[PDB]
Each structure stands twice: as structure tokens, then as C-alpha cells.
Design a protein around this nucleic acid. Structure first.
Ligand SMILES: Nc1ncnc2c1ncn2[C@@H]1O[C@H](COP(=O)(O)OP(=O)(O)O)[C@@H](O)[C@H]1O
Ligand SMILES: Nc1ncnc2c1ncn2[C@@H]1O[C@H](COP(=O)(O)OP(=O)(O)O)[C@@H](O)[C@H]1O
Ligand code: BEF
Ligand code: BEF
Ligand code: BEF
Ligand SMILES: [Mg+2]
Ligand SMILES: [Mg+2]
Lengths: 410, 407
RNA sequence: UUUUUU
């Protein structure tokens, strides 16, 4: 019946349909199954994400290829685009027919769904670039409230630096400070308390095993480009994922991108960027931080509905200036920053947060005056201490209570 | 009757054989008379695909260098089993014809120690699924030797599992190179199953000599005398070969020495870019070092690739400190030694505070975790010399199992 | 390459 489902199904299950149907590697099999079905006059359909090209024609890339070239892409004539003012990144599904003689890929016969809805109103929606941005109004609690070793990290986060819809936050740390895992922890908390928010996890250049473990423990879009992949691929994949987010927000949707190693993407851009000379400090070109700044500055809050929030990990104290530079370039664009110390982790104390450098901007919109000056006191009391001291202190002070309970107490 | 054997055979020995039947000249002669009557010949090597599409079979004595006795491999055959560089091949062969200068692959008998036919079903390495280390690699020995102390402390400070992308950092003179030797011997005794390769790139040649005579396995090497270009090629041959076996679901462990030297050899050999990183190291000169080191991994399909290499710090350049940070962010088993603790002649000079591996909980049992955690809490305070001596004495008492138990 | 970048 449908392509994607045919490509999902196991090898052996396809085979029983083949013999029963009537009549070779999996690709061959599914193609053969499709042709007979199509000759019978029965409808066919696949699903993919739009990618307009230079010549004006576009394709429907698959998620199982990081949205890069795929032998199963579906052609979308320029005619089909102008008909629904489609843009790169739109998620489309519809009836399609196999490649006639000569034609190499399947073709989009007719469109049914544009970004999960009807393409007839997806022409009246206001453009992403003309939306009206705001600070985070609505809020995102991370304390699922489960009295566990993990909900500690969530709570501490919820206290040090709160998150809101449209959060352009950033998690700064030096290798092995728990950043990546903290991201994982944030992911799971968002899934439990916010199934309504669409979750996309983008891993640019971080560890292979991390991607596979992420997929299994995370519910949602998991796109990745390991360090195996060249910088070319990293930029392609990430740029595809950012446009996809933009499009859904256009449909007044709330999306959440978790990017591991944003600075890795900054380096990937660096190599890709044409040398302008005037190399900045740390061997970083002057124009190489435009695209990445534009990628991060993309997250925002819309006054007409939906929103896009990006939380990425930054790298500091690594012997290189590049990282210091990239940290300041994004800190001067984001709305939230959370630092972790390389020392609150060597002690094995977790989460190893540097509560002194953490914090978000415009907190009085993401909290009630009471919780506000509650955290303000918690801040005052801790500032004078040290990194590990403050933490251990902080932690065991709430190891025995709920977030609100702890409050009432203290 | 077999090329490889005739090659390693001493010049004077097989002289007797000759009469009943230049040394390179003679070997050519000797095979050609073995081929005259139709008697078979047998050779072996590691395929190296080239731009033309056809490949050669490199030998270990050449260090996988261009070799005169190499076996040409028709692209025809490669397609037959879709081979790739680094594969180990052996099979029937015939003597080079007049005009022809090198030997050719008549037929294939076995690919990667396995019947040639099976290659088609094997899943590609890049398409394999990774995970955090599952099985555990213990260096501890019941021997209770004077030297076993290092294996035991390392086993405590920083566990190693299958597919462990480890890294060992110290200032020169810290016994980091020699620890690597020790580590090499330990898995040799406790793990015959694991395929063992030792790669020495650039660092000293006496070390090469020491290692080969004392290590049970393959010893690929490239002294610093050699330009940066072989260092690259020899290392790349090794890593590809290691990837081949993991495709077979085998367990490969590479004890790379002077990984920073490899990164530097990559730096010396790289297209110029306008930007340069701190330390002089090129901004775009670390992708290849990263992919090489990040090659190690764990597979659900079966088999594993484990790479553990030496890293230099407090070098006097920042290249080295920057490169340490770079692999730090890729690996999952960092190690450290200190000059101050090696000064006093106390060994290992291991710095427990800085040492550590990621996701130890899967490698160690709950009991193992608690004792380790207790230990680290107690040692954290103590100084490198004081702390180290402090545990060493207790370690001399009993192997780590008994020591933690009495504790 | 010099400047920038180290
Ligand atoms: N909260 C925590 N709980 C348990 N282990 C942790 C925690 N934070 C850090 N770690 C340990 O630190 C290691 C590396 O941290 P990770 O966040 O993966 O690195 P990075 O921050 O550089 O991405 C992990 O393998 C884990 O064992
Ligand atoms: N555990 C040890 N026992 C005895 N000698 C040691 C020990 N560790 C290091 N050394 C000495 O330190 C010297 C330098 O260490 P080595 O690891 O060989 O060089 P590097 O650490 O620079 O690679 C060695 O020659 C060795 O004699
Ligand atoms: F080493 Be972490 F992933 F920055
Ligand atoms: F981050 Be500020 F706007 F310089
Ligand atoms: F010269 Be040693 F290997 F630091
Ligand atoms: Mg990380
Ligand atoms: Mg050495």
C-alpha cells in the first residue's frame, strides 16, 4: 500500500506478501511490490520532507538518511510548489506513481497533507520571517516531580535557569561535565511533561554510541551526524532540520530542538566558509559565525502562535580560543545560559552545575513574584560560596523534598 | 612451497632445498620451478585498493609499504566479493609472466580468515550499530607480581570495556609509554581471544625493538626517523585492517603510542588554510585524527574495536594541550600520570583524581561501584604522591578483590 | 607567506 511502511517492515514479512501477491535486495523487492500494485490501478503513497532545488524542482527526503540524497526521494514539480507556495522543509505526503521509463525516482502524483494538515489553508498562513517575536511568556517546568536521583538535575535546572517557550538557551561546559547527559535528562523531562511540544534532537559531531543510546531513550525526531561525517554533511543535515522547525512554527506549532555540540557546527561552518582574511582570535574567520549565529538566533517566541526553542551545548576551557570566542558570540544572542564546572564533576558531585554563572534573562515572565524572590534569596545565599561547596550544599538541601515543598520549608 | 614461508625462511637454510629442487632472484627462481610442473603456489597479504580500481597485497615486514613480492588483485575479483582496503586475503596464485613484474592473485581461498563466499552477507562497518562498552576487560592478575600493581590501580581508577575509546595522558618521563607496554602484556595474558595490534607511530625505535620482542601479537610501527607521510599511510592501513575484522564480529584492540604525534603528522601533512588554531595546529587539521580515533566502538551485531593511545601534556607547546582536549571530547577512557609523582620514583605515577571512564556502572557491578566510589571519595583529598603511595601499599597486600573486601 | 591566524 504505502512506501515508507514497506521500507519499515522487516525483510521476511515482505517476502510472504511477494509470493501471495503473485511474484533481489529489499530495495528491489519493495519496488517490485509497488509496480504490480500500481499496474492494478491501486493507489500508492510515500512521505518525505520538501527540499526545493536551484532549478525550482524539489524532492521529499527521508529521515532515515538524515534528510540527504535517497534513491527513494519523490519528485515535486515546480508546478506542485507554486500551487501551495511550498518551501524547503515542509513535511508532505500524497499519492504517487512509480518511475515511468527513463524517470529515475518516484514522482509526487498528488498532494494530500502539507505539514500534517490541508494544503488549502497552508497558503494563507503568515510567513515565519514576518511573525512577531516576544520574550518567553508561557513556561516549561522541568521538575517532573518523581522523587528520584535524576529529578534532582531537572529541579536544579528549573531553579538555576528556568526555561520558557521560545528559549534560546545554551549549556556551557568543558568536556566531561555532564552536559550531553544533562541534555538527555532535559529531553526525557520534556517528553513526560510536554508531549504537546514537538521534539527534535540534532547531534552534530558528537559520539556515535550517544546517538544510538539517544534514539532508544528519547521519543521523537532523532537526527544525527557523527564525527565520522565531514563538515559538509553536518551543515546540510542541521540546515535541513532548522528549516523543518521553522515550517512547523509557521503552523502555530511549538517545537523544541536539542542540539549537542553547537560549537561543533560552528567549526563545521568555519571550514565550509570562504576565507575573507581578517582571521579573528583563535583562528576563527570573521564571517564564519554569521550562518551559525543565524541558526541559533532562529529560535524565538511568536505573538500569533507556536514557537521554536533551541537548547545547545557550548564548549569552554579547552586550550583553544575558538571555543571562548564562540561562547561569547552565542551568549550575546541567547536568552539563557547554564554553566557546568570541570571540578564539580571530578568530585563526582552531580549535577555539576555552576549555579553562580547560570541563569536566564527576563525571569519575571517565566515565574510568579514568590518563586522569583524565592530563587533570588537562594541566589544571594549561594553567591559567596565556592563551586563544589555551593553545589553539595544546594543538592542535599533538596535531596529530601519536592521543589515546592523545599520552598515552603526554607 | 609457500611464498610467505620461503620469504621469512633464512637465506642460508633453504640453500639445501635449492639443489634438490640474489635471494629475491632465487625466491623468484624457486617459485617458478614450483610452478613449472603445475605445483601450486600460495601467498598472503592485505589488499590495498588503488585509484585505477586494482589493488596490491601488502606485507607486515614492509610495514605495509610498497613491496616487490606483492600480489596484484584484479578489480574483477574485488567486485566478486566487493572487497575493501585492509582485508586480509590468501589463495592460489601463478608466477609473473615475462613482461609481468609482480605476482598476481590466481584465486581467492579465504577472506579475513573466513571462506570467501560469506562476504556478501556481512553488514558494513559504517552501517553497524554502536553502544557503550558492554563486556569488561580486566587487567588484574592473580600473579600478584611487583609489576601487576599498575594493572590493578588502572583497573580501579579507570575501567576498560570492549570498544573502549581510551586515552592515556602524561608529561614525558611519566611511564606512560611503558605503562602501555604493561597494558599490552596484561590483555595478552587475560585475553588471547582479542585480536591484538600495536601501532607505534613516530615515537622512538628502541621502543619498537623492545615492544616486538616482548609483545604477543602484531607490531606495526614507524620510527620518528620516517617522514610524516608514511606515519599517516601506515596508521591508515592498520586502522582499515582493524575495521575489516570488526565487520567479521571479531574483537580488535589497538594500543597506539604517541597519538599526538599522529595528529602532528596529520598537521605537517595537510592542505594550507588561512586560519590556524592555538599552538600552531591548523584549524582544519584534526578531522582525520578524530575519525581515526573515533573509529573504536562497540557493536550489537557482534565484535568490537578498542583504541587506547598515549597523549602528551605540559609539553611546552599548546598544540599538545589543545590536542589533548580535542580527543578528550571524543574518547571515554581518559588517564593521567604526573611528573611530580614519577619524580619520587613512585609508580604508577597515575593521578587518580583526574583519571576516570564514562558510564562505569555498566562495566562494574553494584558492589564494584560502591567500593570504587567510596575509594575515590577518600582519595580525592590525598595528594598524588601521598594518595598513590597510600593505595599502593594496600594493593601490595592483596589483588584488588581482597583489598577492597578487607577494607 | 607578509599582515590576520600561532
Ligand atoms: N549526573 C550524572 N550522573 C551520572 N554520571 C554522570 C553525571 N554527569 C556526568 N556523569 C559522567 O560523566 C561522563 C561524561 O559526561 P557527558 O555529559 O557525557 O560528557 P560531556 O558533558 O562532555 O558531553 C558520563 O559518562 C558519566 O559517567
Ligand atoms: N612503573 C615504573 N617502574 C619503573 N620505571 C618506570 C615506571 N614508570 C616509568 N618508569 C621510567 O620512566 C621512564 C620514561 O617513561 P616512558 O613511559 O618510557 O616514557 P614516556 O612516559 O615519555 O612515554 C622509563 O625509561 C622508565 O624507566
Ligand atoms: F566532552 Be563533552 F562531550 F564536551
Ligand atoms: F548579550 Be548582550 F546583548 F551583549
Ligand atoms: F619522550 Be617521552 F615519550 F615523553
Ligand atoms: Mg558531550
Ligand atoms: Mg613515550
Amino acid at each position: 500500500m504505502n512506501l515508507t511502511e514497506l521500507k519499515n517492515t522487516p525483510v521476511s514479512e515482505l517476502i510472504t506478501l511477494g509470493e501471495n501477491m503473485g511474484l533481489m535486495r529489499k530495495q528491489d523487492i519493495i519496488f517490485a511490490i509497488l509496480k504490480q500494485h500500481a499496474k492494478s490501478g491501486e493507489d500508492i503513497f510515500g512521505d518525505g520532507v520538501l527540499e526545493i532545488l536551484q532549478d525550482g524542482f524539489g524532492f521529499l527526503r527521508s529521515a532515515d538518511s538524515s534528510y540527504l540524497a535517497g534513491p527513494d526521494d519523490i519528485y515535486v514539480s515546480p508546478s506542485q510548489i507554486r500551487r501551495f507556495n511550498l518551501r524547503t522543509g515542509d513535511t508532505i505526503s500524497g499519492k504517487i506513481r512509480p518511475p515511468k521509463e527513463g524517470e529515475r525516482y518516484f514522482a509526487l502524483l498528488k498532494v494530500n497533507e502539507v505539514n500534517f494538515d490541508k494544503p488549502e489553508n497552508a497558503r494563507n498562513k503568515i510567513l515565519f520571517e514576518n511573525l512577531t517575536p516576544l520574550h518567553a511568556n508561557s513556561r516549561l517546568r522541568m521538575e517532573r516531580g518523581n522523587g528520584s536521583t535524576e529529578d534532582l538535575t531537572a529541579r536544579v535546572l528549573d531553579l538555576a535557569s528556568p526555561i520558557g517557550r521560545g528559549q534560546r538557551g545554551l549549556i556551557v561546559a568543558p568536556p566531561k561535565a555532564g552536559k550531553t547527559m544533562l541534555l538527555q535528562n532535559i529531553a526525557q523531562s520534556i517528553a513526560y511533561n510536554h508531549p504537546d511540544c514537538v521534539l527534535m534532537v540534532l547531534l552534530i559531531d558528537e559520539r556515535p554510541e550517544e546517538v544510538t543510546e539517544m534514539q532508544r531513550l528519547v521519543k521523537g525526531e532523532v537526527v544525527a551526524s557523527t564525527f565520522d561525517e565531514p563538515a559538509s554533511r553536518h551543515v546540510q543535515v542541521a540546515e535541513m532540520v532548522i528549516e523543518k522547525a521553522k515550517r512547523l512554527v509557521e503552523h502555530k506549532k511549538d517545537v523544541i530542538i536539542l542540539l549537542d555540540s553547537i560549537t561543533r557546527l560552528a567549526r563545521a561552518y568555519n571550514t565550509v566558509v570562504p576565507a575573507s582574511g581578517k582571521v579573528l582570535t583563535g583562528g576563527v574567520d570573521a564571517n564564519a559565525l554569521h550562518r551559525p549565529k543565524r541558526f541559533f538566533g532562529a529560535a524565538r517566541n511568536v505573538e500569533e502562535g507556536g514557537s521554536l526553542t533551541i537548547i545547545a551545548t557550548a564548549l569552554i576551557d579547552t586550550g583553544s580560543k575558538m571555543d571562548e570566542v564562540i561562547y561569547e558570540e552565542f551568549k550575546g544572542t541567547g536568552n539563557m545560559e547554564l554553566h557546568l564546572s570541570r571540578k564539580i564533576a571530578e568530585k563526582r558531585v552531580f549535577p555539576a552545575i555552576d549555579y553562580n554563572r547560570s541563569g536566564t534573562r527576563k525571569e519575571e515572565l517565566l515565574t510568579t513574584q514568590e518563586e522569583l524572590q524565592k530563587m533570588w534569596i537562594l541566589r544571594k545565599i549561594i553567591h559567596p560560596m565556592g563551586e563544589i561547596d555551593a553545589m553539595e550544599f544546594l543538592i542535599n538541601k533538596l535531596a529530601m523534598t519536592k521543589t515546592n515543598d523545599d520552598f515552603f520549608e526554607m
